[PDB]
Amino acid sequence: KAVLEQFGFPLTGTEARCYTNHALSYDQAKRVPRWVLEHISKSKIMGDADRKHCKFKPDPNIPPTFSAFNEDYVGSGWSRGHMAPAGNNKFSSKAMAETFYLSNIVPQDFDNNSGYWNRIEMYCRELTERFEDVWVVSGPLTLPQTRGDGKKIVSYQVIGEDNVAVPSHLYKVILARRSSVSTEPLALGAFVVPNEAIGFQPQLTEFQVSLQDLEKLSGLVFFPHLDRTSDIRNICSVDTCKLLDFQEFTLYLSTRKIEGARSVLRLEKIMENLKNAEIEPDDYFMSRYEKKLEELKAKEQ
Amino acid sequence: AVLEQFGFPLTGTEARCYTNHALSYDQAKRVPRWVLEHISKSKIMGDADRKHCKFKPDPNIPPTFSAFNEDYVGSGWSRGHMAPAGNNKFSSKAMAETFYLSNIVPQDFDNNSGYWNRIEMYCRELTERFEDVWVVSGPLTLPQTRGDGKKIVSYQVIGEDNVAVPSHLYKVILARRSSVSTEPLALGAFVVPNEAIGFQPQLTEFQVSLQDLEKLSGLVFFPHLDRTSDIRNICSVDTCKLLDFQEFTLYLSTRKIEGARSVLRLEKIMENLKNAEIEPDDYFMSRYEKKLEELKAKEQ
Ligand SMILES: [Mg+2]
Ligand SMILES: [Mg+2]
Known part of the structure; x- marks a missing residue:
């Protein structure tokens, strides 16, 4: 090892990066986060922090050579989509500004951003009315599709001079605990939605996947301290998994x-x-x- | 209350060290991100024979993230060594570990037995002139420009486990003349398509700047190398001449x-x-x- 490491192992830059109210691992090759983890509570989603004061900007902690820039997104046909939502950080002006770092941003379909994804984000905040603590991991995915000749192909656009990767899908893993002292089992759900307009017809459970399936697809292990031999309940069974309807x-x-x-x-x-x-x-x-x-x-x- | 009560997600990118190579594994693509090795005249000699070696899942990788021989066999793609087995004749154990699928990417058959093989042979040739040679090898999935100007990354995934087939392969070569020489270090970075290449293009035609490869791959190579020091182009101090057809x-x-x-x-x-x-x-x-x-x- 000492001889191989004489001039250092290559650096992948996947170390967790922590901010006021979210943490992320950054993909330096795709110029997007791999995962973004946050904790939500009723107190954090209230406050006078206002999003019209925030600006998208490169994360100052990321080497510029691996950073996305606003020029990559503007005019690309894709919106700057928050993974950790700014709306989860009304309690702290600093925390909300850090969600506008492009390390938290992926190219997201405009209608998806303001529509189905927004309604999922709203459900996560709604959960704080019924669970004292809620954890959420959000991130992009680039999933394969089967070509006419039967071969499976991963295909995604890269935008801007920096080749920021546009995901085919987005995921959320939701973990909810009723209270810090309750003996009630934890509630968990994993969801994968296409990065496109969805509308109001499909219910959220139609996009639910097993945690194991999402981990195989994403190459990640979520909430590794969760004892999976213990009693962990399906969040769509203990709660509603019901998004707001059109009205x-x-x-x-x-x-x-x-x-x-x-x-x-x-x-x-x-x-x-x-x-x-x-x-x-x-x-x-x-x-x-x-x-x-x-x-x-x-x-x- | 804190975020890490149940842990940050795990990416599994930590360096994994073996007898004569180290790697960082991509659990989503089922291939290595980078594989680093050290070569010397002594290591490429020995009685270790590759005919006794078998491809197998890396026992250290969680099976859910591992490739398997069933993914490769019949896929139209070969199991391509990143750290070459041929660099480890000195140790049967070291050679066996290069047959772990953590060291393997789907590689074009002609590229594997052809241009890439000739690059591997040149790296071994460098040990005749340098006491120490370090090599980082790995896959790439690079974009192509569509007719409307949009840039698209497209790559095949093979097998039930969706092992990613790279569009290109890279090698970074770092050579030191001797442990006592005052001669500057020599470095070169190269990117070749994962396809048949032939004998017309010289290796320098595939040479790229280290900075350019780092931008494309999202990696920082040899981070302890002082890049403000005098570092020479390996193709200037050496030949970068692969064997010709004859x-x-x-x-x-x-x-x-x-x-x-x-x-x-x-x-x-x-x-x-x-x-x-x-x-x-x-x-x-x-x-x-x-x-x-x-x-x-x-x-x-
Ligand atoms: Mg949004
Ligand atoms: Mg080979």
Whole structure:
């Protein structure tokens, strides 16, 4: 070993990199994370940290030769997709900014990012209403497809001068613990979704896979301290694995759009678009709507 | 409350050390990421014989992430050594460990027995002129540009385990003249396609800058090497000259002698050589006559 290592073994750069509220292993060849691990709780997802103040930027800890840059993504047809979501870090301005490091980012389909993936991220946050602690590992995948001649081929686009790899699929592993003292078994689920528009028809369980199958596909071992001989329950059996439906998701989106409205007229389409959508505003929407209406006419026009 | 209560995910990229090579394994692709070896004049000599060796899963790799012989056999791809078995004649154990599938990538048959073999032979030749030679070998999956300008990485995966077939192979060669010489170190990096190449292109046509290979592979090679020091191009201080068609064919025909088991075989090899317009050299005839006498002394 000493003779082979005289000038050092090659470096792969896969060591875990830790930030305020997430950790990741970086793939220097693909310019994307291999896995991103985070812990979620009800306290962390509340706060005044606001994402419109954040900027995507290269991770300052990654050698520039292996880093992605904004020029790789902009105009590529692919969005900068958070693995550790910025929305999980309302409690800390620093933590949310670090999720905008490109070490946490993969090329993600625009509709997937703002749609099905967003709704999965929302479910993970929803779990904190029922579990005191939730752990999530998210990351990209590049899976094979069978060609016309029967051969299996892995094919993916690389974008920008730096050849950032666009994944065919995205995965999440969710581990939930009811409380730090409870004797209730842990709950776990693994999910793989295509990096494309999905819509509202398929239920989340349709994308569920066994942890062992995901580990074989990804070449990773998740949560290695979990005693797999112990009693560990399927999260979609102990919980709902139910994403927001179209009506719920649209009301949620329309409610958030209120806070960004800068004209009484803009504020009026939101309710108009909503109501014609056969979706009645709930009490929270109307509370935020009237508050914003009063604010807008108290500001310069 | 903390993230690591149940552990960070494991990537399995830690360096794995064997008798005369070390590697980092890619558990997703079922191939090594890099394989490092040290070569010397003493190590490439010995009585270790590759005919006794068998390909087998690396016993240290979790079976769920291992390749198996069933993935390769009948796939159209050969089991290609990264650390060559031929560099380990000094130790049967060291040679057996190069037949662990952790050292193996799916390699084009002609490339394996042809251009890559000739590069491997050049690395061994370097031990005649340098006391110490370090070599890092490994696979690559490089993109190709589509008609619309989009760049696409495409590679086959073979077997039930989806072993990744590389588009290219790389070698990084680091040579030191002696433990006491003040001569600067010599380094070269090379990238060849995983396909038949032939004899027209010289090895320097496949040479790339170390920095370029590191960008393509996502690796940093020989990190203790002081790159601000005086480091020379191996193809400037040495020849980077592979055997040509005549030399390589004579070498192959000479090796075929020792495997000949009929006088009719032994005559075919010499006939083929001559029809190739290549005259046997003195070493060929020495081995040829020894085998002819041997075959006449064996049961017919
Ligand atoms: Mg997103
Ligand atoms: Mg070979």
